[PDB]
Design an enzyme around this catalytic site. Structure first.
Site, PDB file in Angstrom:
ATOM      1  N   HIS A 118       0.832  -1.231   0.000  1.00 21.56           N
ATOM      2  CA  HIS A 118       0.000   0.000   0.000  1.00 21.56           C
ATOM      3  C   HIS A 118       0.858   1.269   0.000  1.00 21.56           C
ATOM      4  CE1 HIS A 118      -3.451   2.527   0.429  1.00 21.56           C
ATOM      5  NE2 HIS A 118      -2.898   3.113   1.505  1.00 21.56           N
ATOM      6  N   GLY A 122      -2.226   5.177  10.104  1.00 17.96           N
ATOM      7  CA  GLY A 122      -0.780   5.161  10.357  1.00 17.96           C
ATOM      8  C   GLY A 122      -0.332   3.846  10.949  1.00 17.96           C
ATOM      9  N   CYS A 162      -0.842   0.869   9.608  1.00 18.77           N
ATOM     10  CA  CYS A 162      -0.559  -0.118   8.536  1.00 18.77           C
ATOM     11  C   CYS A 162       0.896  -0.612   8.677  1.00 18.77           C
ATOM     12  CB  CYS A 162      -0.834   0.532   7.176  1.00 18.77           C
ATOM     13  SG  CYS A 162      -0.876  -0.537   5.743  1.00 18.77           S
TER      14      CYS A 162
HETATM   15  C1  LIG Z   1      -8.649   2.759  10.867  1.00 23.72           C
HETATM   16  C2  LIG Z   1      -7.497   2.040  10.263  1.00 23.72           C
HETATM   17  C3  LIG Z   1      -6.501   2.410   9.454  1.00 23.72           C
HETATM   18  C4  LIG Z   1      -5.752   1.250   9.238  1.00 23.72           C
HETATM   19  C5  LIG Z   1      -4.498   1.098   8.441  1.00 23.72           C
HETATM   20  N1  LIG Z   1      -4.401   2.145   7.434  1.00 23.72           N
HETATM   21  C6  LIG Z   1      -5.294   1.999   6.253  1.00 23.72           C
HETATM   22  C7  LIG Z   1      -4.595   1.362   5.040  1.00 23.72           C
HETATM   23  C8  LIG Z   1      -5.532   0.635   4.105  1.00 23.72           C
HETATM   24  C9  LIG Z   1      -6.465   1.606   3.431  1.00 23.72           C
HETATM   25  C10 LIG Z   1      -7.441   0.923   2.438  1.00 23.72           C
HETATM   26  C11 LIG Z   1      -6.721   0.092   1.401  1.00 23.72           C
HETATM   27  C12 LIG Z   1      -5.661  -0.836   2.019  1.00 23.72           C
HETATM   28  C13 LIG Z   1      -4.749  -0.123   3.062  1.00 23.72           C
HETATM   29  C14 LIG Z   1      -3.386   3.059   7.482  1.00 23.72           C
HETATM   30  O1  LIG Z   1      -2.534   3.041   8.398  1.00 23.72           O
HETATM   31  N2  LIG Z   1      -3.315   3.998   6.509  1.00 23.72           N
HETATM   32  C15 LIG Z   1      -2.249   4.952   6.465  1.00 23.72           C
HETATM   33  C16 LIG Z   1      -0.921   4.480   6.002  1.00 23.72           C
HETATM   34  C17 LIG Z   1      -1.759   5.341   5.127  1.00 23.72           C
HETATM   35  N3  LIG Z   1      -6.272   0.206   9.854  1.00 23.72           N
HETATM   36  O2  LIG Z   1      -7.374   0.722  10.561  1.00 23.72           O
END
Ligand SMILES: Cc1cc(CN(CCC2CCCCC2)C(=O)NC2CC2)no1
Ligand SMILES: Cc1cc(CN(CCC2CCCCC2)C(=O)NC2CC2)no1
Lengths: 297, 297
Positions: free
Chosen positions: A41, A139, A141
C-alpha cells in the site's frame, strides 16, 4: 492466581520496527537482517496495478528510518501484498525468527505502531472469519502480530486495513491475506463469524483453576449431543482433536472434557443468571488451551 | 477503530529485569544504573525483624544475574519494603526513568517476570482498595508496573504478594505499600472495593467514539442526583474535577458529561437488556480518560 489477556513482551519486536515513506504515505515496516518488510500500500497514490506501480519506483523513492538513522534502500521487490526493501545495513537487533501462518482460533500479540514507533501491545485471536478485533488508527498499517517461544519470534500477521464493521484484516509475512480480502477500497465485508468452542472450554478450565466453580455440574454429555447445541448457538463443532488438546487441563482440574461440555451447554441454554466467570458476564473465546496452560498454575 | 486493554511496549523495562537469589529464594529485581531494586522478602528464611535479617547478610550472599552475566553486589541497604543492592556494573540499557506513586483509579502496565525473564505484559488499574487484579504465580515477586511517556519510564509498582481473594498487593519503588498491607503471612484481606465512576464514563465515551450509541438518551441529570445513584450502586462519587477531566472526550463526541451520567444512571438501574458495550456485558472501570484519548481517534 488471576487470569488476564496477556501479551508477549514486545522488546524483541520493538527493535525491528521502522518507518517507511513513499511520496506522502508513511507506514510501518519490519527490519530483519538486511530486509524491510512493509505493506505494498505504501506505493499507492490518489484499482491499482501494483506490478506497474512498482516498476515506476526507484530505490531512492523509499525513505526508510530506524529511529533517527536513515537506511539506504539498495533493492526492492514485491511478494504478494508486501514489499521487500533490501537495505545497506543488517539490523543488529534481529531476533531469532520464523514466518508462520496461523489458524483461525489461534492467538497472537499485536505491537500497534505509528511512524515506526511502537504505541501499545495487546492480544488478538484470528477469528473463524479471518478478521481480528484489534485497535488501529490511520498510520498503523504495517504493525505486526507475533508469538514468542524460547526467544524465537514467530511473526504471523502484518496489519493492512479496517473493514466496515470496525474489525481488521491483514496478511501473513509472506504477504498472503488472511481471508477473502484485498488491499484496496471495495465493498468487501467480514463474513459471518462463529464462537471458538475449544477456547471457551479452555477459559472455563482457567476459571476452575482460579476458583470459579459455580457453573460446574454432576452431568456429562456426548460429543454428538454437545455438537447439536453448539450448532444452535453458532459455536464451532468440537472435534476429538479438541478434546485431546484439552487433555492436560482436564487432568489438572479432574473435570472430564465432556463434563465441562455439559456445563457449557447449560450456560448457552440458561445464561449466567447475573453471575460472572473470571470477571466476564459473557463466554470468552480468545484464550487457547496453550494460553491457559502458559499463564495458570 | 477498536478499543482494547493495551499495555505499553515493554522493551525498555525488559532490559532492566534481573534474577536475585538469597539462600533458596529466587525472585526478580529491577536494575537501573548501578542499583538492583527488589523485594526485601528475598532475605527471609522458613514475624521477621528485617533490620536484624539484613545486618546478618554479606554482599556475597546475594546472587544477581542479568541474563547469563553475574553482577557483583558491592553494597546493600533496606528502603522500607525493598532492598537496594549496589552492583559493580551500571546497566547500559537503563532508560530515562522516574519513581512515581500512583493514585487509586489510575492504570499501569505490568511486566510479569519469573527468574529475571519477562513472561507477559498486561494492563492493571490500582483499585480504590489499593489492590490490583493481576495474574501472578510463585516466582513473580519483584515484577514491576509502569507507564511510559515520551521514552521516560515512570515505575509505579513492585509486586509482593497475593491476598486470600486472589487479588495482588505491592509497593511503590520507594518500598512503601499501596494500602494497609505488610510483606508477611497474616490474616490480612482486601478492604471493600468500589467502582471507579470517572473511568466507566471514559469507557462509555470510548464506546460512542467507536460507534456504540444504544445506551445514549436525550436526558441530563444533576451531579447531586447522579451521586445519589452512584452511592446506591457502590460507585465512587463523581467530582467537578472528574467532569473537567472528561472535558476533551465530551467535546469530541458532543455529549455533555451530565448527559453521559444520565446514560450511566439508566444502565445501573436497568442493566443492558442482553446488549453489549465494546464487547462487554459489564460496565468496565479499568480505562482512564487518558487511556481512552491515548488509544481512540
Ligand atoms: C482505521 C485504520 C486504518 C488502518 C491502516 N491504514 C489503512 C490502510 C488501508 C487503506 C485501504 C486500502 C488498504 C490499506 C493506514 O494506516 N493507513 C495509512 C498508512 C496510510 N487500519 O485501521
Ligand atoms: C500466587 C503469588 C505469588 C506471588 C509472589 N510470591 C509470594 C511472595 C510473598 C509471600 C508472602 C509474604 C510476602 C511475599 C512469590 O513470587 N514468591 C516466591 C519468591 C518466593 N504473588 O502471587
Amino acid at each position: 492466581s488471576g487470569f488476564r489477556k496477556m501479551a508477549f513482551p514486545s522488546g524483541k519486536v520493538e527493535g525491528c520496527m521502522v518507518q517507511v515513506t513513499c511520496g506522502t504515505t508513511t507506514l510501518n515496516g519490519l527490519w530483519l537482517d538486511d530486509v524491510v518488510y512493509c505493506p505494498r500500500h505504501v506505493i499507492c497514490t490518489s484499482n491499482p496495478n501494483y506490478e506497474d506501480l512498482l516498476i515506476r519506483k526507484s530505490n531512492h523513492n523509499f525513505l526508510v528510518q530506524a529511529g533517527n538513522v536513515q537506511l539506504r534502500v539498495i533493492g526492492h521487490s514485491m511478494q504478494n501484498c508486501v514489499l521487500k526493501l533490501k537495505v545497506d545495513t543488517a539490523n543488529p537487533k534481529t531476533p531469532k525468527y520464523k514466518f508462520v501462518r496461523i489458524q483461525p482460533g489461534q492467538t497472537f500479540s499485536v505491537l500497534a505502531c505509528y511512524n515506526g514507533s511502537p504505541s501499545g501491545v495487546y492480544q488478538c485471536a484470528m477469528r473463524p472469519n479471518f478478521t481480528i478485533k484489534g485497535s488501529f488508527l490511520n498510520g498503523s498499517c504495517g504493525s505486526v502480530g507475533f508469538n514468542i517461544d524460547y526467544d524465537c519470534v514467530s511473526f504471523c500477521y502484518m496489519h493492512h486495513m479496517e473493514l466496515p464493521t470496525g474489525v481488521h484484516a491483514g496478511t501473513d509475512l509472506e504477504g498472503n491475506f488472511y481471508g477473502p480480502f484485498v488491499d484496496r477500497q471495495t465493498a468487501q465485508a467480514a463474513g459471518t463469524d462463529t464462537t471458538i468452542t475449544v477456547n471457551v472450554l479452555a477459559w472455563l478450565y482457567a476459571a476452575v483453576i482460579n476458583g470459579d466453580r459455580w457453573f460446574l455440574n454432576r452431568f456429562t454429555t456426548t460429543l454428538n449431543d454437545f455438537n447439536l447445541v453448539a450448532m444452535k448457538y453458532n459455536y464451532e463443532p468440537l472435534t476429538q482433536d479438541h478434546v485431546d488438546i484439552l487433555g492436560p487441563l482436564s487432568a489438572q482440574t479432574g473435570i472430564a472434557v465432556l463434563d465441562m461440555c455439559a456445563s457449557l451447554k447449560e450456560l448457552l441454554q440458561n445464561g449466567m443468571n447475573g453471575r460472572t466467570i473470571l470477571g466476564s458476564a459473557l463466554l470468552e473465546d480468545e484464550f487457547t488451551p496453550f494460553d491457559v496452560v502458559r499463564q495458570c498454575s
